């Protein structure tokens, strides 16, 4: 199997990745870095989320529609992993690529609230600085930004934490252990999927949103009421 | 305003760099009630250059 | 308006002819620089284009058949034949610029795909078109 | 209009080397 | 056109910068081009001369200094002349269209009996060449040579559907690549190396184009011809093969991408090197026997330069080219 | 005109009785992401202000 | 302004723990050089040597030394052009395959640890039968199995 997978990966790499990363994955000076030693996790995160191929150099590559199937992604990841290893994918106990099982360390059907309570503090210390409380995004220097954490699946959250994409820091499994990462996943998916009890969230941005809402349209409708009740002469 | 915890180093105290674990209290319940406890819990742990 | 209504049948006949020709040709003819098969874009485009010119030609003709001999459609008209009222024309309006601004807000919302921007832009647009269309009818204030 | 105690080090970093003692 | 141009410096002016053309159909197109410029220069000369006559004869001060008066002759219609001047253009463009159809039908034919078939793949942003067919007379061993790599072609064929069921495009996967070609002998261009496609002289050749992502275009100025290479050429009804009756003379010829494809569009160059028939038999034999050997080594083996000469790879550094030297040399 | 004023008064009665009905009988206690009746919890305060 | 001749993306380097040496012009490159010292005791050097000489001279990795300490690396055949010699400690090369396609070669390697410190940096010399490279390299632990290792009170 694995050699057929590496053949498929090499053939896809040769018509999609070879201009910026070189034929021996060494990198091309100002087009892309070396892929020697990135691992299957880096290729999975980058290709599956749609970030690769980059097609113009800017401040930041953006998440877009994926160019390769998940099977094709894993073929390319096999081929790249043969050029010096690196961190790999998180598989579950049966052997399938792990997904909803990563929703907290004590997952069993549903998210447990202790995991959310510890992952909230972990996220608020290690992540929210860039991604805002509950992961709505943030702006960095010179056109860079921390994305919105909605589109990412659990495997992508884990591999983002491992691989440190673009200006994101790395969080090895010695820094944040497996359980702490799984609790961060639990927190992201709890907040990403629980409607606010107090009605419409207004994007959960914070005070600027409610400001704009009131200080434009809220005062506008009461000005309209005043014009209904009062005289224009 | 001149001091912080790190000033303790100048008193010849060993001060590790402690990383935060975010560990929360645990609830133990039994035939006489329920209580939140932190007795075996540690908010900070030492760390090593390989981490 | 005889000549205007009638000259829309030149392009109607021509575009219909080119539509049928293009259709049969693209499905039957073969050359080494293209693959045989009916080309649907040009087909639909030409037949709908002949539909547009048909639409204008037929409506303008069906109107022409019951308008009187107007002085502007007459070769020896005197300048005093159109004396009287010519019609109502808007002297001023702030609402065209308002509508352009509403469409601008809508389009930027579509760009970024912020849902609130799309909602607000559509609300602004219906409002500004409504206020444009109610300009010369707003009541006198009754106080 | 600059802090008078915020200079660049005159001496350059010498690319030093570390080690740890051990039982063997 | 069969008729040759006037030749000499007059021909050099008439063909107005066109290469001489290294195929028979390039010669035909260049002929037709020179003659249509004889026609065009006649039209341009006489009508610019009319616009000069307007400056120097039909002026008002010249007319007043010879007593013509206030106004000219208020002529407005001349039904015969404004008929003739309309009918003459029609019978001009009909003859132009006749010769156009002749030349187009010769260039665009697909019945030239190809002996070497090359599968071309374009991608963002380089080329991949591979020999699909080499009929026996020059083939390795003498038996008609097929180039397909069955295992890799089968992997590409199996990528036609997603096992996880995300198959939106008429039942097929969005990342289907089963239209692409995978051969054993291939040359793959890189940022560091120009791909040099080796071909034989005096042999009918077929090129089979396609792209991995975005439209590209295969312009060899010495063929005086280009065609767009598309992804899924059959879904677009884009005829993906074209054939040349021969290359008449050997040498190295540049080729460029002639359809906008993104950032490095201007850096997507290839070389078409043309060698003797027996030299090509040797090249293909060497490559078929020891498939680990590269393209440069085979080129050296048949006595040619290892790397492209009509073009060179670009310096990839985004600033180093600022003072003119934008080309990196090879051994 | 009398029908116009009567309409809004009758709708005020409906709104106020809806408020008291909601504030009493609508289920209002906190439900987590995994629970049954998370919808009924999240619509409570919305319904309160609607009425 | 960010799509200029200096961009953020075009500057970025491989988010990996090792260093690299060699340009677009150099004949033989090294990528992801790092002294991998396990937390149990085993040590070695991780790197990938890449031949890209256009004169088609093969380069044989003759020797590797780390702060003057000799490296044991199992037998490797020469690196022809567009071939790659991968190297790590054997425990970590057992976690990946050796491709039949292209030209890649896995060779295990090991060091006798003189007492390097995690976090630090040491000079590493690669010596080929044609020449030599010298490169600073950080001492680091190898990667873990993803998603299995919780931390414990101890
Ligand atoms: C929900 C969503 C929100 C929309 C719903 C509707 C909200 C409005 C309802 C609340 C009010 C209720 C009361 C009421 O009925 O009031 C009617 C009241 C006017 O009543 P009226 O009696 O019909 O007044 C006409 C009289 O003849 C006027 O007689 P007059 O001559 O005495 O008065 C003149 C008056 C007339 O002007 C106005 O009353 C408003 C002018 C609006 C046009 C603004 C320029 C737009 C350019 C684009 O103008 C001024 O006094 C001068 C002000 C400056 C005008 C603008 C100059 C341009 C630079 C600024 O309407 C307004 O004032 C509404 C104006 C809204 C403008 C449309 C939206 C434009 C969008 C902004 C542009 C942003 C850029 C887009 C691109 C980039 C995006 C990223
Ligand atoms: C109509 C408007 C059309 C605008 C033109 C668009 C193209 C812009 C352009 O030509 O930029 C050139 C490059 O600038 C930036 O690098 C600059 C140097 O090149 C480079 O060697 C340096 O290394 C950069 O050094 C800085 O950057 C380092 C990071 O490496 C940091 O260590 C540190 O920051 C360091 O100092 C350096 O950056 P500055 O920021 O100092 O200078 C920017 C500015 C300076 O030019 C001038 O003074 C020319 C004066 C004439 C102006 C009028 O350039 C420009 O705008 C010049 C071009 C404008 C001409 C347009 C026509 C005029 C009409 C508009 C009024 C970089 O952003 C590249 O992306 C980019 O291609
Ligand atoms: C008018 C009242 C509207 C209202 O109550 O808004 C609906 C509310 C909003 O929830 P939302 O803002 O999406 O929170 C996501 C935060 N992560 O909650 C919802 O969107 C759910 C509304 C369900 C209504 C149908 C059942 C009655
Ligand atoms: C009727 C209701 C319409 C008005 C709603 C206003 C609240 C805006 C809002 O919904 O904010 C959240 C939104 C997130 O985007 P969303 O539309 O949910 O769509 C997904 C993103 N593609 O966020 C956005 O799309 C962007 C909102 C940010 C607005 C600008 C923030 C920075 C500058 C604000 C300065 C302070 C406010 C000044 C306003 C008053 C001035 C007098
Ligand atoms: C009074 C306010 C009523 C708002 C409408 C109620 C509601 O639940 O709106 C749903 C929708 C927000 O849904 P959502 O997909 O989360 O938007 C992207 C968030 N950044 O609402 C919108 O996107 C538009 C709200 C205006
Ligand atoms: C206006 C003139 C319209 C008349 C069209 C002239 C051709 C009609 C007969 C052509 C024919 O043989 O049809 C076959 C062709 C599809 O090709 P194929 O199926 O390969 O042909 C052999 C099958 N007998 O058949 C076709 O697909 C013919 C379709 C012709 C183009 C249709 C353009 C308009 C359709 C939408 C109009 C707008 C609707 C709103
Ligand atoms: C109307 C609103 C006015 C708000 C008050 C602004 C005071 C700025 C004074 C800075 C003095 C300073 O800290 O100056 C000292 C500081 C050192 O100066 C420097 O850094 C050198 C540059 C100083 C340039 C200041 C602006 C000059 C034009 C007004
Ligand atoms: C002024 C008209 C010049 C006609 C040049 C014809 C050259 C001889 C020819 O026929 O040479 C043969 C060649 C085919 O003609 C061509 O390309 C000629 C292409 C232009 C045809 C113009 C026809 C005008 C009536
Ligand atoms: C605002 C419109 C121009 C935006 C140019 C831009 O997005 O440029 C982007 C690019 C970075 O700019 C550069 O490199 C050049 C930097 C600016 C050069 C001076 C700008 C002239 C000032 C015109 C003032 C007009 C007042 C009215
Ligand atoms: C040039 C246009 C590129 C092509 C083609 C591909 N990638 Fe790329 N990649 C490029 C850049 C400039 C960068 C730096 C980071 C960024 O986001 O800009 C990258 C990064 C990667 C990575 C991450 C490496 C790391 O340090 O973790 C991977 C795994 C990667 N690229 C893989 C990859 C693959 C598999 C591609 C073909 C499908 C591919 N890239 C195309 C620029 C370019
Ligand atoms: C600012 C210095 C950051 C911190 C701290 C963290 N992240 Fe981040 N993240 C950041 C950037 C600039 C990016 C974009 C990278 C790219 O190549 O696009 C990201 C990306 C992610 C993602 C991917 C989301 C997606 O679109 O698929 C995830 C899931 C993510 N980051 C999660 C995450 C977590 C959980 C963090 C705390 C442990 C964290 N990030 C830190 C910037 C920054
Ligand atoms: C950073 O590199 C972004 C792109 C820079 C392009 C430079 C050329 C700019 C030409 C003038 C643009 C005028 C825009 C007017 C905006 C209202
Ligand atoms: Cu291209
Ligand atoms: Mn084109």
């Amino acid at each position: 199997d694995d050699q057929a997978l590496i053949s498929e990966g090499k053939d896809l790499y040769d018509v999609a990745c070879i201009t910026c990363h070189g034929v021996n994955l060494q990198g091309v000076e100002d087009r892309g870095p070396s892929l020697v030693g990135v691992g299957e996790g880096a290729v999975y995160f980058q290709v599956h989320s749609g970030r690769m191929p980059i097609l113009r150099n800017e401040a930041q590559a953006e998440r877009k529609a994926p160019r390769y199937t998940e099977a094709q992604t894993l073929a390319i990841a096999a081929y790249v992993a043969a050029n010096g290893g690196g961190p790999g994918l998180v598989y579950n106990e049966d052997g399938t690529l792990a997904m909803e099982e990563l929703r907290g360390e004590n997952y069993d059907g549903q998210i447990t609230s202790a995991d959310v309570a510890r992952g909230g503090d972990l996220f608020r210390l290690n992540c929210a600085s860039c991604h805002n409380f509950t992961g709505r995004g943030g702006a960095l220097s010179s056109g860079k930004y921390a994305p919105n954490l909605d589109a990412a699946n659990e495997q992508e959250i884990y591999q983002a934490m491992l691989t440190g994409p673009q200006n994101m820091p790395k969080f090895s499994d010695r820094q944040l252990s497996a359980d702490e990462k799984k609790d961060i996943i639990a927190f992201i998916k709890s907040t990403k999927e629980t409607p606010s009890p107090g009605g419409y969230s207004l994007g959960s941005l914070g005070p600027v949103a409610e400001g704009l809402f009131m200080w434009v349209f809220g005062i506008l409708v009461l000005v309209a009421a005043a014009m209904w009740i009062g005289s224009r002469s | 305003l001149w001091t912080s915890g790190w000033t303790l180093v100048e008193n010849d105290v060993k001060v590790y760099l402690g990383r935060d674990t975010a560990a929360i209290a645990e609830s133990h319940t039994d035939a006489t009630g329920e209580h939140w406890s932190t007795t075996g819990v540690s908010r900070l742990v030492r760390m090593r250059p390989e981490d | 308006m005889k000549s205007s209504a009638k000259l829309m049948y030149g392009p109607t006949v021509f575009m219909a002819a080119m539509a049928v020709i293009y259709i049969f040709a693209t499905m039957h003819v073969s050359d080494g620089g293209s693959v045989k098969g009916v080309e649907w874009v040009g087909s639909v485009a030409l037949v709908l284009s002949a539909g547009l010119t048909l639409m204008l030609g037929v409506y303008l003709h069906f109107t022409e058949v019951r308008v009187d001999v107007l002085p502007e459609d007459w070769e020896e008209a005197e300048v005093a034949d159109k004396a009287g009222t010519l019609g109502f024309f808007s002297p001023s309006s702030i609402w065209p610029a308002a509508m352009s601004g509403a469409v601008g807000f809508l389009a930027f919302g579509v760009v970024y795909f912020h849902y609130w921007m799309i909602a607000v832009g559509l609300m602004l647009l219906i409002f500004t078109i409504t206020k444009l269309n109610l300009q010369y009818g707003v009541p006198k204030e009754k106080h | 209009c600059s802090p008078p105690h915020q200079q660049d080090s005159p001496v350059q970093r010498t690319n030093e080397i570390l080690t740890t003692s051990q039982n063997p | 056109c069969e008729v040759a141009p006037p030749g000499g410096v007059l021909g050099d002016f008439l063909r107005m910068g066109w290469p001489d053309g290294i195929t028979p159909e390039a010669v035909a197109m260049g002929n037709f081009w020179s003659w249509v410029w004889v026609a065009a220069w006649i039209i341009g000369i006489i009508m610019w001369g009319l616009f000069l006559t307007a400056i120097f004869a039909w002026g008002a001060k010249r007319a007043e200094k010879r007593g013509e008066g206030e106004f000219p002759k208020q002529l407005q219609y001349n039904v015969p002349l404004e008929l003739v001047l309309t009918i003459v253009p029609i019978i001009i463009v009909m003859v132009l269209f006749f010769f156009t159809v002749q030349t187009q039908d010769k260039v665009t034919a697909l019945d030239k009996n190809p002996e070497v078939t090359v599968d071309v793949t374009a991608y963002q942003w380089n080329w991949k060449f591979g020999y699909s067919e080499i009929d026996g007379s020059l083939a390795p061993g003498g038996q008609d040579y097929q180039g397909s790599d069955p295992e890799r072609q089968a992997a590409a064929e199996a990528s036609k559907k997603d096992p996880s069921g995300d198959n939106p495009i008429h039942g097929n996967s969005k990342s289907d690549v089963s239209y692409l070609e995978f051969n054993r002998i291939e040359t793959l261009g890189t940022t560091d190396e120009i791909p040099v496609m080796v071909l034989p002289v005096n042999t009918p050749i077929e090129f089979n184009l396609a792209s991995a992502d975005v439209a590209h275009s295969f312009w060899v100025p010495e063929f005086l011809f280009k065609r767009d290479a598309y992804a899924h050429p059959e879904a677009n009804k884009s005829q993906r093969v074209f054939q040349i009756e021969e290359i008449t003379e050997e040498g190295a010829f540049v080729g460029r991408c002639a359809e906008m494809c993104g950032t490095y569009h201007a850096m997507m160059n290839f070389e078409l090197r043309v060698v003797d028939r027996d030299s090509f038999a040797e090249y293909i034999s060497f490559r078929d026997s020891n498939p680990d050997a590269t393209n440069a080594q085979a080129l050296e083996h048949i006595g040619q330069a290892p790397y492209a000469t009509s073009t060179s790879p670009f310096v990839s550094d985004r600033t180093a080219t600022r003072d003119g030297e934008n080309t990196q040399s090879n051994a | 005109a009398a029908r116009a004023v009567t309409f809004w008064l009758v709708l005020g009665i409906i709104g106020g009785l809806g408020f008291l009905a909601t504030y009493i009988f609508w289920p209002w206690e906190y439900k987590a992401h995994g629970d049954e009746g998370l919808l009924a919890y999240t619509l409570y305060t919305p319904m309160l202000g609607i009425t | 302004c960010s799509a200029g001749q200096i961009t953020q993306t075009s500057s970025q380097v491989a988010a990996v723990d090792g260093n690299q040496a060699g340009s677009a012009n150099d004949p033989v490159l090294v990528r992801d050089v790092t002294v991998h010292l396990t937390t149990d005791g085993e040590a070695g050097v991780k790197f990938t040597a890449i031949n890209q000489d256009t004169s088609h001279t093969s380069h044989t990795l003759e020797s590797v030394t780390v702060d003057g300490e000799e490296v044991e690396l199992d037998d490797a055949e020469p690196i022809e052009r567009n071939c790659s010699l991968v190297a790590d400690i054997q425990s970590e090369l057992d976690l990946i395959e050796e491709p039949e396609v292209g030209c890649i070669q896995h060779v295990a390697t090991s060091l006798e640890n003189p007492g390097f410190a995690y976090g630090g940096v040491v000079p590493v010399e690669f010596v080929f039968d044609t020449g030599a490279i010298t490169i600073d390299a950080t001492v680091s632990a190898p990667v873990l199995e993803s998603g299995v290792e919780n931390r414990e009170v101890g």
Side-chain angles (χ1 to χ4, degrees):
Chain A
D1 280 5
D2 299 81
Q3 297 291 346
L5 197 59
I6 286 160
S7 295
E8 182 173 310
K10 172 157 167 53
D11 270 324
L12 292 181
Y13 181 100
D14 285 3
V15 295
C17 312
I18 192 165
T19 285
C20 300
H21 297 292
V23 66
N24 290 98
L25 285 70
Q26 70 256 61
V28 178
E29 292 279 48
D30 269 300
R31 303 202 180 175
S34 177
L35 294 190
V36 171
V38 300
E40 296 197 23
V43 176
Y44 182 81
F45 177 76
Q46 294 284 336
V47 173
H48 190 256
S49 56
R51 283 165 167 88
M52 292 289 131
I54 276 170
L55 298 170
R56 72 193 214 285
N57 295 112
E58 312 164 57
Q60 177 158 327
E62 47 276 305
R63 184 176 182 121
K64 59 188 192 295
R67 194 252 176 283
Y68 282 112
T69 311
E70 195 167 43
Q72 293 170 317
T73 303
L74 297 169
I76 298 162
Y79 172 57
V80 175
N83 282 66
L89 305 183
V90 184
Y91 298 99
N92 61 2
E93 289 292 350
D94 68 80
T96 308
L97 189 57
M99 294 309 315
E100 202 179 341
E101 301 294 347
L102 298 170
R103 288 197 171 199
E105 175 57 22
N106 305 276
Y107 177 87
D108 181 18
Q110 289 289 354
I111 301 177
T112 299
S113 287
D115 287 11
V116 183
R118 185 178 72 147
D121 274 11
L122 288 161
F123 186 89
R124 283 186 264 100
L125 184 62
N126 302 272
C127 308
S129 48
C130 291
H131 290 273
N132 153 267
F133 320 105
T134 82
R136 301 298 84 198
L140 308 178
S141 177
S142 300
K144 302 191 249 63
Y145 55 98
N148 184 38
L149 295 181
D150 290 342
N153 63 8
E154 295 86 340
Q155 188 63 217
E156 280 171 339
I157 297 162
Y158 206 106
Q159 297 306 331
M161 268 187 277
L162 285 181
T163 60
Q166 292 196 76
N167 272 268
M168 179 161 154
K170 266 196 175 201
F171 298 84
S172 64
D173 284 0
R174 296 190 173 88
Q175 182 172 358
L176 292 172
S177 65
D179 59 309
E180 296 178 338
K181 292 197 171 70
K182 290 182 210 170
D183 285 17
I184 283 161
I185 291 163
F187 174 79
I188 290 160
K189 296 295 182 191
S190 305
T191 56
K192 189 254 181 199
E193 308 178 329
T194 305
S196 49
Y200 177 44
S201 283
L202 290 165
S204 307
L205 302 180
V208 297
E210 295 98 331
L212 179 69
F213 181 85
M214 179 55 84
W215 284 41
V216 182
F217 302 107
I219 190 68
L220 189 67
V221 61
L222 285 181
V223 161
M227 291 196 63
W228 181 41
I229 293 155
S231 187
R232 216 166 166 246
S233 301
Chain B
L1 296 174
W2 307 129
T3 61
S4 51
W6 306 99
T7 309
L8 290 168
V9 178
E10 300 295 329
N11 303 11
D12 193 5
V13 180
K14 191 191 271 189
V15 181
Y16 301 91
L17 314 183
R19 64 147 59 86
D20 203 351
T21 66
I24 55 168
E26 295 190 359
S27 39
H28 300 168
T29 173
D30 51 54
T32 185
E34 179 173 333
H35 73 286
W36 294 87
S37 51
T38 45
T39 313
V41 184
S42 69
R43 184 79 199 201
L44 294 173
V45 293
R46 301 174 292 174
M47 59 163 283
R48 304 172 67 87
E50 57 272 9
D51 295 333
Chain C
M1 41 161 48
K2 283 188 171 181
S3 305
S4 182
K6 268 66 183 281
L7 67 86
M8 278 287 186
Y9 304 143
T12 308
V13 176
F14 175 73
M15 288 198 281
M18 294 307 101
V20 292
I21 293 157
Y22 181 77
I23 285 152
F24 280 118
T26 54
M27 73 180 66
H28 180 63
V29 181
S30 173
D31 58 6
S34 57
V35 184
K36 192 189 296 184
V38 77
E39 202 284 283
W40 282 94
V41 177
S43 298
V44 165
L46 290 168
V47 301
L48 268 288
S49 308
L52 176 139
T53 55
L54 183 284
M55 167 73 150
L56 294 180
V58 172
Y59 180 87
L60 288 176
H61 193 183
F62 202 71
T63 302
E64 163 55 32
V65 294
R66 73 204 74 206
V67 299
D68 304 335
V69 178
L70 306 177
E72 56 257 47
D73 299 348
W74 192 241
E75 294 276 44
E76 284 288 345
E78 73 286 13
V79 181
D81 199 354
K82 283 190 78 161
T85 303
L86 195 74
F88 172 75
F89 297 80
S90 169
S92 67
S93 189
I94 194 62
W95 301 117
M99 295 148 64
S100 81
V103 174
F105 199 76
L106 174 57
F108 273 105
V110 164
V111 161
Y112 298 110
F113 223 58
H114 299 324
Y115 305 153
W116 76 271
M117 291 192 76
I118 292 159
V120 166
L122 291 167
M123 292 274 287
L124 280 164
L125 187 53
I126 179 56
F127 174 81
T128 55
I129 294 164
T130 303
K131 275 262 182 210
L132 175 95
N133 281 283
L134 293 180
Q135 178 173 348
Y136 305 114
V138 173
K140 187 203 291 183
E141 184 165 45
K142 60 184 74 174
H143 176 81
Chain D
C1 285
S2 63
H5 292 276
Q6 191 173 292
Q7 285 75 36
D8 311 332
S9 62
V11 62
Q12 66 188 13
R13 61 190 289 101
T14 190
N15 191 12
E16 60 184 314
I17 181 159
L18 300 166
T19 183
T20 178
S21 58
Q22 61 191 29
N23 304 80
Chain E
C1 217
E2 172 59 12
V3 182
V9 295
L10 173 54
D12 186 58
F13 167 62
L14 280 176
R15 77 185 304 107
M16 216 177 107
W18 271 35
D20 190 62
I22 61 176
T23 72
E25 71 186 42
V27 170
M29 286 182 288
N31 298 352
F32 175 59
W33 165 261
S34 304
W35 288 114
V36 297
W37 270 100
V38 170
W41 287 126
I42 282 162
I43 292 159
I45 288 161
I46 61 98
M47 257 190 287
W48 294 323
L50 281 160
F51 307 150
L52 293 159
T53 304
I55 293 162
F56 295 114
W58 301 334
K61 295 183 74 174
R62 178 176 180 275
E64 290 162 356
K65 285 285 186 289
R66 71 180 188 164
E68 293 193 34
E70 180 68 1
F71 293 102
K73 179 174 186 172
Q74 303 292 287
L75 178 58
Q76 185 168 324
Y77 287 108
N78 189 16
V79 172
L81 183 63
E82 68 188 329
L83 277 166
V84 165
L85 293 167
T86 304
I87 297 298
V88 166
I90 299 167
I91 60 177
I92 289 160
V93 299
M94 293 274 184
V95 175
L96 280 162
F97 178 63
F98 180 80
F99 298 137
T100 296
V101 169
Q102 282 191 339
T103 316
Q104 175 268 128
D105 275 35
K106 292 186 74 170
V107 174
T108 306
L110 294 172
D111 57 347
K112 303 181 187 174
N113 298 324
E115 202 81 346
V116 175
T117 305
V118 182
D119 288 336
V120 186
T121 307
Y123 53 91
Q124 288 181 96
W125 286 276
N126 219 305
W127 299 90
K128 182 172 77 71
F129 300 115
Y131 299 98
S132 217
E133 295 114 35
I134 299 172
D135 291 0
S137 63
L138 74 88
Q143 302 296 318
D144 55 324
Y145 167 82
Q146 299 292 326
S148 314
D149 206 327
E151 274 58 38
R152 294 159 59 212
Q153 190 70 61
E157 169 54 26
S159 291
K160 185 180 284 177
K161 288 201 185 182
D162 179 22
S164 195
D166 191 7
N167 290 311
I169 315 303
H170 302 303
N172 282 19
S173 69
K174 196 152 63 269
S175 308
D176 181 2
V177 288
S178 60
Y179 65 95
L180 295 172
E181 298 287 6
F182 298 91
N183 312 94
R184 304 187 219 92
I185 301 167
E186 289 183 340
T187 81
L188 184 62
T190 64
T191 310
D192 185 46
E193 183 163 324
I194 293 291
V196 187
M197 161 163 57
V198 184
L199 293 160
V201 293
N202 311 125
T203 304
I205 293 159
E206 172 174 312
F207 300 95
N208 182 38
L209 318 177
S211 176
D213 40 19
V214 162
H216 297 275
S217 202
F218 180 80
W219 185 23
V220 187
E222 294 292 344
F223 290 175
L224 301 174
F225 176 86
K226 81 198 85 193
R227 183 164 292 178
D228 293 3
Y230 290 106
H232 299 88
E234 298 84 353
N236 291 269
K237 278 78 75 173
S238 168
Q239 181 51 271
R240 59 183 296 183
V241 303
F242 81 94
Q243 300 175 357
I244 60 170
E245 178 168 13
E246 59 170 329
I247 303 182
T248 62
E249 187 61 282
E250 29 182 4
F253 310 106
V254 70
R256 308 178 201 274
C257 188
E259 180 64 73
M260 167 48 51
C261 54
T263 301
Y264 301 98
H265 166 67
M267 312 200 153
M268 193 174 163
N269 292 319
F270 65 97
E271 175 157 298
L272 193 150
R273 195 170 293 173
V274 187
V275 295
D276 190 14
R277 210 165 196 274
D278 300 4
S279 198
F280 183 86
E282 183 182 8
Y283 168 88
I284 206 84
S285 296
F286 181 84
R287 290 222 75 185
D288 195 347
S289 298
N290 45 76
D292 57 320
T294 64
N295 192 53
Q297 282 154 316
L299 281 166
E300 283 190 325
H301 177 65
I302 58 156
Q304 305 304 122
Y307 302 103
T309 54
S310 275
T311 184
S312 169
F314 284 89
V315 165
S316 69
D317 192 324
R318 213 166 161 95
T319 64
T321 64
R322 181 175 290 177
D323 301 316
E325 303 189 340
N326 61 333
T327 173
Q328 51 193 357
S329 180
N330 295 30
Chain F
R3 284 194 274 96
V5 179
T6 299
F7 175 85
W8 291 109
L9 291 171
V10 169
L11 187 60
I13 297 293
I14 291 157
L17 296 167
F19 180 83
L20 299 176
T22 306
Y23 187 80
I24 298 161
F25 303 103
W26 197 284
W28 66 275
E29 300 86 354
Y30 168 73
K31 252 64 182 161
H33 178 22
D35 293 17
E36 301 298 341
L38 177 60
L39 183 69
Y41 165 58
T42 59
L43 300 171
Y44 181 66
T45 288
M47 283 289 297
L48 285 185
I50 292 285
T51 57
Chain G
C1 282
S2 305
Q5 293 196 326
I6 299 293
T7 73
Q8 311 281 31
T9 52
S10 64
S11 301
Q12 303 200 9
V13 295
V16 299
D17 276 24
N19 199 4
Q20 61 173 74
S23 64
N25 192 41
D26 286 301
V28 52
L29 316 168
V30 289
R31 294 283 178 271
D32 199 13
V33 179
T34 171
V35 177
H36 267 196
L37 164 65
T38 60
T39 54
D40 184 55
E42 171 181 33
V45 196
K46 183 180 190 299
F47 59 92
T48 311
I50 305 180
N51 188 352
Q52 59 179 25
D53 167 67
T54 52
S55 193
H56 291 103
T57 60
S58 51
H59 314 301
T60 318
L61 180 61
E62 284 291 304
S63 186
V64 188
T65 172
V66 179
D67 193 28
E69 304 296 349
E70 182 175 21
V71 175
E72 164 54 27
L73 66 158
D74 62 73
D75 54 312
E77 65 198 339
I79 313 179
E80 274 66 44
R81 193 180 79 118
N82 297 341
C83 293
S84 293
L85 179 61
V86 178
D88 197 357
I89 56 177
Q90 185 70 73
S91 49
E92 298 295 309
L93 291 185
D94 291 353
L95 309 177
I96 51 177
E97 315 306 336
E98 190 184 46
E100 301 173 335
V101 292
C103 187
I104 290 157
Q105 168 167 217
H106 288 36
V107 300
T109 166
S110 64
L111 266 164
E112 287 294 345
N113 184 21
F116 296 133
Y118 284 120
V121 177
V122 300
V124 178
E125 307 285 318
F126 301 93
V127 181
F128 304 85
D129 55 10
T130 59
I133 307 172
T134 179
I135 170 164
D136 288 330
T138 190
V139 185
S140 203
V143 82
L144 290 163
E145 178 76 333
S146 300
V148 308
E149 169 52 23
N150 294 347
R151 87 198 326 126
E152 192 165 12
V153 295

